[model samples]
Target: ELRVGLEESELWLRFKELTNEMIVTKNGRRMFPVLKVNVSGLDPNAMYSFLLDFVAADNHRWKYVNGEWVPGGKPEPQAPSCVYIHPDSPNFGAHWMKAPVSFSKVKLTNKLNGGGQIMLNSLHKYEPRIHIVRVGGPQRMITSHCFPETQFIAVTAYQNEEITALKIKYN
Candidate 1:
């Protein structure tokens, strides 16, 4: 059996209202408000692998100006996506179910050739996704989770001024 739980969401929803913007670069930038979850109902003796993925929120390009984001034009072509795995994965469920699970190492970027780079379009919104697979010892079913309320826009630079203010206020 497999079960997953979402973390406290007040902070995530607050940012999502501002249309959370993540600064991505050719060198790759780590996504803020990173994906975090809790897993349970796993065979405590089994090993598992966790993967992270993000999908576009829509087909429109966006520009953040005049204190808000507006549709700009057709979005640029999409690049192949990549998934980031938790380094601690393939460990016992004792480890997986111990604390709140986090994919902190996963980053959002449009950089080509950057190892494990997850490609995303500038000015477009996206939702973060996660998958967990049982991989060793006593086998169990694969499971996954995603949170749409965690949607964010990828950008090369800060867009919304309010977002800039909030980031500094909290960071």
Candidate 2:
């Protein structure tokens, strides 16, 4: 059995109240309230690779108005797909479980880059998924976990002033 726990749950919820906004730049912007987690129920000796993928939360585009977000027209075409793998992946489960798995280095970009960054469409909502794969386990070794509170809107700039302050205060 495998389980993934969300770290900084309260911090994430604080952002979620304003419908979190993740900055996407031409180069890349690191996520605020970064995605970190604690894992358990893993096979101690087995090797595992942790991957991060951003999936569109809905097909509609979002606009900020009157201090809130509202759906508008259809979203822009999907950006080139990309996934960020934990650098320490393929390590033993014990290694991963020993400490909180933090994906602080993962960056979001409106433009595509090498394999290291994830590309996203501005004005769209997204949810990050954590895929865990057992290196030499059973055929169905891959499992994906998501935390709804981690959902956010991708923007070239911060849309909400409150969110900006939250980022500044926390970082």
Candidate 3:
């Protein structure tokens, strides 16, 4: 089983700070706050799959109103839901975990290329979800779990305004 604590992990906290600092204007920015988790309690020899997804806010569709982006309006027709599969999914967890786990390298794009990279609308808000799956060998079994959710904040460029407040109050 995996164990997590509320105690602030400096590594994770730093990632959060970095992400908030890398925002771009009129363009997509990749999250620098990559999540890297270490797995030791699990069966090291087993294979595991990792997945990432983006979820929109409830009842609020982002739109440009009054010359600025704001929530609350008739939401556009639901866009096809897409899940990004790690390009390295072919590798086993044992091998992948050997190095620091990095979701930061994951890119977000505005254009739909039908390839790697999460797609999002400009000026719209989004949240990211991470999932882990265990593939049992010989038995041909699979199990999955979603980790902590992350809230997406809209910004013109990299800003650390929220990181300090978030970390000081809740890590």
Candidate 4:
């Protein structure tokens, strides 16, 4: 058994204070205060996997303007169930537990290209979730460890003045 814990609560909280609305672009955006975590309680000889995904927090189309969220035209389809697997997946747990687990390669995109990056919808709410999986064999993931956190809205543009001000001032 292995334990996964977020490594940057303070940083996450700092951004979350401003509602944690992430900005997405046509190309994509790198999640700030990135997903830094620590892994522990692992079997030295067994291999492990770490995966990341973004899930819709609610089923509502939101429009942000003048520090308020109004109903949008329509709710777009949910993002695909894309999973960002750790590059070093299936590595010995000892290799994982030996250092801080970082998924800096993870990126948020709106396109479902073959990139395998997690796709998202603008103006929708989402949360970054991480899970640890155990392999049944060479490529079978049989067990899962879910780590879910608070949800944050996704916006192509910043709406909350306070949040914008905070980001400009501190971020």
Model 1 superposed RMSD (Cα)? 2.3
Candidate 4 lDDT over residue span 1-171, tens digit each: 556677867666766765777677667676655677788887777777888777886667777667666666565567545789989897887888888888877767767666856678877878777777766457655444433443567777767876666567654
Q: Would you list the C-alpha lDDT of every candidate in the order shown?
A: 0.77, 0.88, 0.52, 0.70
Q: Taking the tens digit of each residue's C-alpha lDDT, what string does model 1 give over 39-129? A: 8887788778888778766778888677878877765655435778888877888898999787767766766654866778778878787
In order of appearance, the predictions have TM-scores of 0.87, 0.93, 0.60, 0.79
Of the candidates numbered 2 and 3, which has the greater lDDT value?
2
Q: What digit string (tens of lDDT, one per residue) describes model 2 on residues 55-115?
A: 8888888999888899999555655357799989888989999999999999888886765
Report residue 24 deviation for candidate 2 (angstroms).
0.8
Angstrom error at residue 124, model 3: 3.2
Candidate 2 backbone collisions, by pair = none
**Measured by TM-score, how close is model 1 to the native structure?**
0.87
Model 4, stretches more than 4 Å misplaced?
69-80, 136-150, 161-171
* Predictions: Cα RMSD each: 2.3, 1.8, 5.9, 3.0
Best by TM-score: 2
Q: For candidate 3, lDDT tens digit of each residue in 1-171? A: 643222224655554433432243333455645555444444567776767776554445554445444566665654533676676775675676576555656667666665666666554555555556666567554434333334454445423545645545543
- lDDT-based ranking, best first? 2, 1, 4, 3
> What's the TM for model 4?
0.79
Please identify model 1 stretches exceeding 4 Å from their true place. Answer: 75-80, 137-141
